[PDB]
From a paper:
AMPARs mediate fast excitatory signaling in the brain, and a change in their number or function underlies lasting forms of synaptic plasticity. AMPARs are homo- or heterotetrameric assemblies of the pore-forming subunits GluA1–4. The activation, deactivation, and desensitization of the receptor is controlled by ligand-binding domains (LBDs) which form a self-contained clamshell-like structure within each of the four subunits. Following glutamate binding, closure of the LBD clamshell around the agonist causes separation of the D2 domains, applying tension to linkers between the LBDs and the ion channel which opens the gate.
Author numbering:
A (entry chain B): 4 to 264
B (entry chain A): 4 to 262
Amino acid sequence: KTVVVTTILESPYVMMKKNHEMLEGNERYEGYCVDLAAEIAKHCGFKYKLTIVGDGKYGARDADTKIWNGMVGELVYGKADIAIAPLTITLVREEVIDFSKPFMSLGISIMIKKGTPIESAEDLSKQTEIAYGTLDSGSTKEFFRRSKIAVFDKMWTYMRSAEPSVFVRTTAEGVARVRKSKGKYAYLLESTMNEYIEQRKPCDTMKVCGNLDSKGYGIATPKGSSLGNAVNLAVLKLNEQGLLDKLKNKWWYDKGECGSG
Amino acid sequence: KTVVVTTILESPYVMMKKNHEMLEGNERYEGYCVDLAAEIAKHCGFKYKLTIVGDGKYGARDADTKIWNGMVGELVYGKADIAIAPLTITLVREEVIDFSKPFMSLGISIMIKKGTPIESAEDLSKQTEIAYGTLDSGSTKEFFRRSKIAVFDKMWTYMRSAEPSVFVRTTAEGVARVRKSKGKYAYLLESTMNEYIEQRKPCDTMKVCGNLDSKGYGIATPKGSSLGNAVNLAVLKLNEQGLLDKLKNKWWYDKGECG
Ligand SMILES: N[C@@H](CCC(=O)O)C(=O)O
Ligand SMILES: N[C@@H](CCC(=O)O)C(=O)O
């Protein structure tokens, strides 16, 4: 029985090679999560097929219908057997899916144009001439909606109120918004992606110092999945061997295009 | 009549214009604290004269001799009526002079050459092949001297004992030492100046994220000065009016060469 792996196009976790138009199957994709998916399949011993999430979203729950979208949705409604993507382990998501122990750490961070007069999240709260927003349906927006910190709650109010909408449908759109906005838009995105983009051309982006919290990515499986335990202890057997850190160094910093390292 | 303002050459707070040799008086100087001095004098309503501290130091107290040097020294001994400079508000200085409320926040930070394998102050404490030092007579040196945190005390011991001299007499000397040291010297300086240098050519210096503490700059006046209240309410009306942030952005980022 073939295993259907649900994932999302997100640099550097899953990208499509240049020759991806003359290729088929799993040989079209490249990144941290494709290799991680391969090695996970080797340790567990199942053949798998890479699928991109249909709606292109990570996973949020409608307040009124209590329905789920994105990869979490595709797991709850039996559209995929396992999710191998930068999917943050959150309390709400744990209600409907199972998470392995974190295979990578991260935290919400700010991304600005190099040379911009911003130095903190509280600075963002005070000012108004620079806009800032969040991904459309991800751990970040959920964090700001349910946050009780005064600064974070204020930022949330501004974002929900500020129009022309400050939110974005894909992180790429956010980074592009920052780069084109001539330092008038700052993007709130997870630290890993911020660092990655920071170390790649045109080298005009900067990560502000300070993570707003500390979470991690986990391997998600449907509640009651026969594959849950195997992958859950598998990622630990890969952490002991240190291959996860070798992958991080492989895709983030071993080939940094900007300045120095 | 005229009030003598004591200050210090420290970019971008007080600098000398590109010409300045074709100018005289207060029109030779430029920076954050020159403008702040202008607005303070406007709100209070006094004509002032800008003077650079004679010994070129901020302010420390000899343990045995007591006595003060730098701008604080010039304030205690009636050599100047007010000090408008990046002068950190500390308890010891507050014992002998008066400080307005902070017009700018800051914290001790590390400055490295871009491409250096350092990520924290504790990393510096553990290793020994990379040197690190501080300004000679400022809030930073006193911070490391009177710190009881294990790492900070260890760094202090290293700096004071191991000396191919690691200290510097002016911030410029520190930044130059970092740039020339090929990533083998890291400079411990307040975060604000580190950010400024980070935003100026040749764009080869970097500020580590971890700040070692959190303090602020205040306008200093001698104990019992008639100008204390006036300047305090001036800086409060300028923080309320928001001009301080416009000045920070003006001198740090409005003319950033590294981006
Ligand atoms: N990895 C996050 C994406 C949200 C973000 O980048 O802020 C998630 O699982 O939803
Ligand atoms: N500005 C500091 C000195 C600079 C430093 O120690 O980094 C003071 O008021 O003493």
